[PDB]
């Protein structure tokens, strides 16, 4: 019952840490491609404004 | 966004800014036209009323 101590603080709800594994790929995903358009918007001010 | 502040001082509304330049390149290209008749317009004193 000591092991399970131990568990009860090093052990992983796996299911858990993969849930905000995906998580967090996905927001480090998506604002990349954010960071895409707003490096991409001025490229009509020089082609459209000039 | 002390960058934004940053902005907010040097940034360009380079579309306004284009517009003071077109604008006063209006402006710069009239007044020329304008010093060429004040400089062609005595020609008839000397060619008409002499």
Do not use: C, H, Y
């Amino acid at each position: 019952n000591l092991t399970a101590a131990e568990s009860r603080i090093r052990d992983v709800d796996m299911a858990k840490e993969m849930s905000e594994f995906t998580k967090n790929n996905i927001l480090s995903q998506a604002p990349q491609a954010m960071l895409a358009q707003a490096n991409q918007q001025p490229q009509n001010v020089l082609q459209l404004l000039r």
